[PDB]
Amino acid sequence: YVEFAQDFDFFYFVQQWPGSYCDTKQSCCYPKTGKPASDFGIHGLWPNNNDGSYPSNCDSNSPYDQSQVSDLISRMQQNWPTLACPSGTGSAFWSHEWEKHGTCAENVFDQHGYFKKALDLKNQINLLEILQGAGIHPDGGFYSLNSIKNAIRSAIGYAPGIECNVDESGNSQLYQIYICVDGSGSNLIECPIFPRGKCGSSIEFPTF
Amino acid sequence: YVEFAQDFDFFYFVQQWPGSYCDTKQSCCYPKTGKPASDFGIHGLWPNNNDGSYPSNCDSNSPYDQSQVSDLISRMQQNWPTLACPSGTGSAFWSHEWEKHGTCAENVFDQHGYFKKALDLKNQINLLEILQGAGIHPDGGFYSLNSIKNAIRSAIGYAPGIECNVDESGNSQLYQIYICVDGSGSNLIECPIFPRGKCGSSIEFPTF
Ligand SMILES: Nc1nc2c(ncn2[C@@H]2O[C@H](COP(=O)(O)O)[C@@H](O)[C@H]2O)c(=O)[nH]1
Numbered sequence: 336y337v338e339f340a341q342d343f344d345f346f347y348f349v350q351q352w353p354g355s356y357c358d359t360k361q362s363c364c365y366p367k368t369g370k371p372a373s374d375f376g377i378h379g380l381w382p383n384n385n386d387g388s389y390p391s392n393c394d395s396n397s398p399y400d401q402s403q404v405s406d407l408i409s410r411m412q413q414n415w416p417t418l419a420c421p422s423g424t425g426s427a428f429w430s431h432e433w434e435k436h437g438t439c440a441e442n443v444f445d446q447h448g449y450f451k452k453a454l455d456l457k458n459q460i461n462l463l464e465i466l467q468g469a470g471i472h473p474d475g476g477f478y479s480l481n482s483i484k485n486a487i488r489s490a491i492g493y494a495p496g497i498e499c500n501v502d503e504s505g506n507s508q509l510y511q512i513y514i515c516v517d518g519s520g521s522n523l524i525e526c527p528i529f530p531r532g533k534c535g536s537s538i539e540f541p542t543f
Numbered sequence: 544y545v546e547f548a549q550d551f552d553f554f555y556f557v558q559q560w561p562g563s564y565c566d567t568k569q570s571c572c573y574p575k576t577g578k579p580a581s582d583f584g585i586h587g588l589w590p591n592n593n594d595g596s597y598p599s600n601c602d603s604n605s606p607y608d609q610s611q612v613s614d615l616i617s618r619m620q621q622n623w624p625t626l627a628c629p630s631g632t633g634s635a636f637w638s639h640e641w642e643k644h645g646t647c648a649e650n651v652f653d654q655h656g657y658f659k660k661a662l663d664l665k666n667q668i669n670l671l672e673i674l675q676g677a678g679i680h681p682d683g684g685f686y687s688l689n690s691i692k693n694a695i696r697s698a699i700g701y702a703p704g705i706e707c708n709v710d711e712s713g714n715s716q717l718y719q720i721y722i723c724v725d726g727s728g729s730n731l732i733e734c735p736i737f738p739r740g741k742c743g744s745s746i747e748f749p750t751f
């Protein structure tokens with residue numbers, strides 16, 4: 336039989352701050368069920384390569400099948416909300432993450448395993464609590480990039496990747512936080528490489 | 544529906560018109576082999592899916608090696624020129640196409656097979672001859688998008704995908720032509736889905 340090699344090296348576990356996704360010039364919409372909790376939400380678990388490149392949309396014959404994760408839906412509704420317009424259930428977002436990223440790690444996790452791992456990592460890495468534990472709150476104030484990185488490093492033991500975007504007022508703000516997981520999906524690891532964060536020395540942590 | 548490949552659905556065989564790549568606000572540079580012939584050049588062979596998505600960067604451990612295509616180099620220099628700046632040999636362009644697209648079909652064609660297939664497809668489909676036979680010439684004049692599509696469809700049996708970019712005056716021009724091939728790369732097929740053309744009803748076919 337033909338043996339196929341893994342198409343990726345490690346994973347980026349990415350979380351987004353709703354306050355930064357919703358205060359730009361573009362529109363954002365709360366899920367049909369209402370305003371999500373003021374906590375970071377899961378964006379996705381992304382297979383990536385050591386050289387910075389990453390595989391995407393790896394298996395057209397492995398379409399998202401929500402029935403395979405029915406027992407995880409309530410947790411996904413709370414921890415993986417969609418903020419796109421018009422107001423959605425979250426399914427289009429979850430389907431997109433599985434088809435674009437999950438399929439590229441099919442040899443490691445099937446659909447249930449993929450979403451479960453993301454949920455477990457989310458509970459393992461509570462960014463809001465870690466940051467507020469260090470006096471960094473989503474109150475519209477400004478914080479140094481290094482204070483954010485180090486507060487997280489001291490808490491989980493690994494250096495995070497920080498991505499920023501811009502609000503309407505033109506201020507640079509904390510948008511997404513990346514944590515690396517080994518290729519086997521078993522444990523956290525230091526990131527072999529970090530994407531361009533586009534952050535200033537000091538950034539805003541907007542209220543939501 | 545019929546499938547011919549395991550991880551993706553079909554292929555887009557894409558060719559570019561040099562006159563349209565070189566007359567925009569961006570710079571273009573003739574390759575080290577000199578000014579290319581005034582004919583369409585290969586852009587690449589791209590695995591694509593029925594839902595519009597496409598796999599990309601499927602194997603970072605499979606770098607492009609010119610040794611794998613040594614016997615195809617002459618054909619590649621003549622039919623697959625790079626027009627990017629600064630003037631290049633073409634290796635960076637061919638390497639990019641393999642890394643981004645070729646690797647995603649590595650279980651169908653290896654490097655030599657991939658480049659050979661693209662070269663063979665170009666031999667089979669002479670777009671310039673087909674168009675000029677239908678009175679559509681690269682003389683800077685405008686032609687109907689429909690007449691361009693009909694000419695190609697009458698010749699090969701299926702409608703092509705047509706993509707337009709913009710020239711210095713802002714006008715849409717015939718830039719790239721997409722031909723659909725099944726997942727095995729052995730036969731032309733009706734396109735399950737077409738690229739967003741961004742073409743007006745009348746487009747220019749610029750000189751080169
Ligand atoms: N960042 C983000 N994308 C969302 C959300 N809901 C739906 N989407 C969609 O998911 C895509 C994310 O692609 P990715 O960043 O995983 O490669 C977005 O471009 C958008 O179409 C949301 O709440 N946040």
Ligand SMILES: Nc1nc2c(ncn2[C@@H]2O[C@H](COP(=O)(O)O)[C@@H](O)[C@H]2O)c(=O)[nH]1
Nearest residue numbers: 559564586587624625626627636639640643
């Ligand atoms: N269209 C085009 N791209 C070229 C050429 N030479 C080098 N390139 C590079 O190849 C890339 C094409 O990526 P693709 O369209 O295959 O996904 C471009 O972004 C550019 O960096 C050329 O002659 N035409």
